[model samples]
Target: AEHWIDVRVPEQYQQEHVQGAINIPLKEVKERIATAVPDKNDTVKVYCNAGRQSGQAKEILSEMGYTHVENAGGLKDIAMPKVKG
Candidate 1:
């Protein structure tokens, strides 16, 4: 059970993102997360253009009681699989 999330800006998300990642910018992470994901125990993998914002997002999520939070570093590090809209 893994849920992928992208905490980057809309413009950044429009350019590229991880496969199956739900776009939720860091600005509204808390509120959006509540609606996007109801299970606090769900395994969440968060990423941004790089690792910076995702790292911050992970910390925030952790503090907010999200049990499993993983930062997938950067999109460039992995071979991004093609995803159809």
Candidate 2:
């Protein structure tokens, strides 16, 4: 299964995010990513409120040896329904 990660701050993540996405704030991605997606070969989809953070997240994941990490762009760019709280 592909892991969908919302690379936004907790506040923004809590407010709204793509359905099934887990909140792993950008700053915490390096340390937290492994816990969510242990297999380096597993697919990982990352996004943020804006496109910039997700782009950065992709680079960080690639640096850490994640082979299938993808930047899904901003929240608005996502085609799937969002979870609002």
Candidate 3:
């Protein structure tokens, strides 16, 4: 199963985000990713507000031994309908 993560801050994430995406925030990835995705080989799809942060996340995940991480681009580039409270 693939895990979808939103690397945006909580504020942006709460405002709107992709369905089934978890808000990990870019800075907390190193500390939080393992718990969210324990299997190092699991597919992880990450994205940020403008794409750069997701790239950073992909690098972090790779260094941490995650085998399948992808930068799914920016929020604006996402085609799926975003959800919010």
Candidate 4:
């Protein structure tokens, strides 16, 4: 049921969020879901500068009906190179 895995913080700033991953801050998770992810089953991974905001988004997505969801803990957990804002 999940279309994305992200935290509230990352979604806030789109520019230079991350290099490869599509950045969606927690606030836009619900708003962007309609036009962002094509399917609810897609497993999107999410993290933040501190790897903390992921869970809050997880809850929001899960409540929206995403079946699979998990947080990596923080940016170090994500290990994806920053896009340099």
TM-score of each: 0.89, 0.94, 0.93, 0.67
Cα lDDT tens digits, model 4, 33-67, are 65777566667565666665776666776788756
Least lDDT summed over 10 consecutive residues: which range in candidate 1? 76-85
Query: What lDDT, from 0 to 1, does candidate 2 have?
Result: 0.89
lDDT of each: 0.81, 0.89, 0.88, 0.60
Q: Model 3: residues >4 Å from true position, as ranges?
A: none
Instruction: After superposing candidate 4 on the true structure, give the runs of residues whose Cα lies further than 4 Å from its correct spot.
Output: 1-17
Write model 2 residue lDDT over 1-85, tens digit each, in one string.
5888988888988788988788989888889888878899888898999889999999999999999999999998788988898
Q: RMSD per prediction, one decimal?
A: 1.8, 0.9, 1.0, 3.4
Q: What lDDT score is found at residue 73 in candidate 4?
A: 56
lDDT of 1 at 17: 75
Error of 1 at 11 (Å): 0.3
Per-residue lDDT for 3-76 in model 1, tens only? 88888787877777777788888989877888888798888888887789889999999998999888886667
Give per-residue CA lDDT, model 3, range 1-85, as digits (tens): 6888999888999888998889988888788888888998888999988899899899988999899998899888988778986
Tell me which residue pairs clash in candidate 3: none
Off by over 4 Å in 1: 83-85
Q: Quick one: how many clashes does candidate 4 have? A: 8
